[PDB]
């Protein structure tokens, strides 16, 4: 349903691409981005259905302006990025990626996280290595390559809780910012500040993001957070 | 070219699996692993050519023994692991993965007979999620004083194959020395040492044949080389 | 230079303490704190002169109210803390120490940092052991015991600099927040993005704080920062 | 009751050092080490009785041969170091300190650990800061300044244990390499992979070393290890 266009003439809008690709069916989003050396352009076109996108692909190797274009499935080029400074806008992200010679196809921003699409699988991985753990104005940056769609990877275990902290509302509100919570599970009657609880997120990326809560202050305790063991 | 077979009878060995699939095409590797609860076996079959694999897939939903099998493309289920104890055997690695309820489809490992320097193991698992999970659970684990390093494999233009080495002294700026210091991480394509350097801020660029090698080589960051602590990072990609 | 008073009666105000000791010499500061279990008090009295403190020490084992008091030199009980949330007040810091059962003898709070005195050498170390790297609202806390008053431990080296970033002012601006700079030294004619600079802080604590700049975005590059090697 | 002599003539061995000081009181140990540039010697002398050392300090500023010596209390100049390769000798350990231009006054090398004495308080802190986390042959080096000498900083908590691992004996066997164990406490009846044990060590250096067990494989589980909270 998503498509990468490579090597369009630099003089190309979202509109110019939209008018070239209109005849393949309903388009939800069209994003345009400058090449590294600024001589050509990339495009991310997201479609309605599967065949809406497969029509675009049958327009690969075609000549536009004086550039032959490549059109292929945008697959596994997506990372998320969080714990950057509150003031950070979209440009700031694009700037980070520009610092390490990586094109940002698209950035979607609203404890806020951003989802980023790049132009190649290697770029997504390389981005993560270089930037994860970078400090910016006191904030340690956190990135991972997206983890697509079996509790495996979606379940976290929260440890070192007191009795006072073993409260379903608190845990909810302390974790919801990472993504949708499917279920919170607090094993019966833990009446040493060694209480725990399990939380299952809807998607893997939220569980990953939640791992930031590890070694963090919750109320008056340092909590521990990790991926739960998978059911035997 | 590689293929997954799920739900084989619990008594199927490499041979029986080979016997069954040999007629699909030339087969390069067969590996067979127990399921978690030990009631069936998985197998990994690597064909010489893509159509061997295609023909194996057509064997999906067939009955073998008393079992209905599933056959599918095995893709992105490869991780590497290293800096385990020198005495670790392939059983040890399998026991680890078991500790976190992961079936290891195959484990290839330089045998103890070889005493290989900077020894690393490739491990195949049964699902993409397993590889990601496995790296996350196991990385940084401490075994007999060694801190474990694992990453999902990264398959194949200099991007991610090139490392920069910093904090080198004049005496450490020796091509043979670096070659020797890093060659265990995987094949070296080129060692590149800018002239004029001879503040202990000497640097060297090393390019590896593949990205997984350049990744493992990052273990040399914060490590003692001769008499200095060098720093190793992935080279900034060229604009 | 400074004195610890232990086992004062709980009713003992700062004023009352100041009154009891004011016949020892001029007093710069008086600070009072509750015991963990709130049944006596500690005081921190800083004097103008040494004999002033030695005078207060002769007051050791004397009976105030119905409490036998103990007076010693306050030595090696000082830590600095930094990279807490900007919203954090003095009371917030005291809460932290109470979460790990440590009395804050005094907290002084002006890239802000806090200086905290505690009631024992072990408390200082335990406190650092327990709180360093604790994530609070996305800020990973940094603490260290103070390092008392030649280049050793005061000189840092900044690496991975670019030609553009090799600016005396830009570095000064970027680092003076950690404490007084004595000397910035940029080795002539370095003009592959591996430039360096040396900076000498007036005191060691400041150098230690500056280590936070390691692995951090400066302008458009990740810099590395470490204690300089020491001259043979 | 240990003393540090600085600027002895470079030709002084432990023998003629012993003779110069033998009249201060009985001596248990003499260690002699070369200055960085080999132009003088340090000695570490350990006297049997306090007044022995006290008498040696009055030798400070005396001329020996052609050198003005300095004599002082060797205090807070000790670190321990652990997780180096099994084949490391005293010589290898001297080599490390030399690499960072720190004189090793003495080294006691009996999971082994070494105690190392250096010639200034700064050098001990500096030495830990440079060396800690150094990777030698895949072993990440651990070092801390020693911690002199109720439970505070001597008690650890071990979490994430299973039913199988909750055994007085396997715990003793697993932790005794870090130093003498005073007590092992397992809170009754834990038969959620959340089991825990408390261990008290005779001394804080031992507890600190045992923190190494944190994030380590014990049997079939990754254990968690940390300093226990101090009891309210």
Curated annotation (Swiss-Prot), chain B:
Protein's UniProt name: U4/U6 snRNA-associated-splicing factor PRP24
Domain of life: Eukaryota
GO cellular component: nucleus; ribonucleoprotein complex; spliceosomal complex; U6 snRNP
Function: Functions as a recycling factor of the spliceosome, a machinery that forms on each precursor-messenger RNA (pre-mRNA) and catalyzes the removal of introns. Chaperones the re-annealing of U4 and U6 snRNAs (small nuclear RNAs) released from previous rounds of splicing, an initial step in reforming the U4/U6-U5 tri-snRNP (small nuclear ribonucleoprotein) that can reassemble into another spliceosome complex; this step involves binding U6 and facilitating the unwinding of the U6 internal stem loop, followed by base-pairing of U6 to U4.
Full protein: residues contained: 41 to 291 of 444
Subcellular location(s) per record: Nucleus
Quaternary structure annotation from Swiss-Prot or TrEMBL: Monomer. Interacts with U6 snRNA SNR6 and the LSM2-8 complex (small nuclear RNA); to chaperone formation of the U4/U6-U5 tri-snRNP (small nuclear ribonucleoprotein) assembly, the protein is displaced from the U4/U6 snRNP once pairing is complete.
Originating species: Saccharomyces cerevisiae (strain ATCC 204508 / S288c) (Baker's yeast)
Keyword Zinc assigned: no
């Amino acid at each position: 349903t998503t498509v990468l266009v490579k090597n369009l003439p630099k003089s190309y809008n979202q509109n110019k691409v939209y008018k070239y690709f209109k005849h393949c069916g309903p388009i939800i989003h069209v994003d345009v981005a400058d090449s590294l050396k600024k001589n050509f352009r990339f495009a991310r076109i997201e479609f309605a259905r599967y065949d809406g996108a497969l029509a675009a692909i049958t327009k690969t190797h075609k000549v536009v302006g004086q550039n032959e274009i490549i059109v292929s499935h945008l697959t596994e080029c997506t990372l998320w990025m969080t714990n950057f400074p509150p003031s950070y806008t979209q440009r700031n992200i694009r700037d980070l990626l520009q610092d390490i010679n990586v094109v940002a196809l698209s950035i979607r921003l609203p404890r806020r996280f951003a989802y980023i699409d790049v132009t190649s699988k290697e770029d997504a991985r390389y981005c993560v290595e270089k930037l994860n753990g970078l400090k910016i104005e006191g904030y340690t940056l956190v990135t991972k390559v997206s983890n697509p769609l079996t509790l495996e990877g979606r379940e976290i275990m929260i440890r070192n809780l007191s009795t006072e902290l073993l409260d379903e509302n608190l845990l909810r509100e302390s974790f919801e910012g990472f993504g949708s919570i499917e279920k919170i599970n607090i094993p019966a009657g833990q009446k040493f500040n060694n209480c725990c609880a399990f939380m299952v997120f809807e998607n893997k990326d939220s569980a990953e993001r939640a791992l930031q809560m590890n070694r963090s202050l919750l109320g008056n305790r340092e909590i521990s957070v990790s991926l739960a063991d998978k059911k035997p």
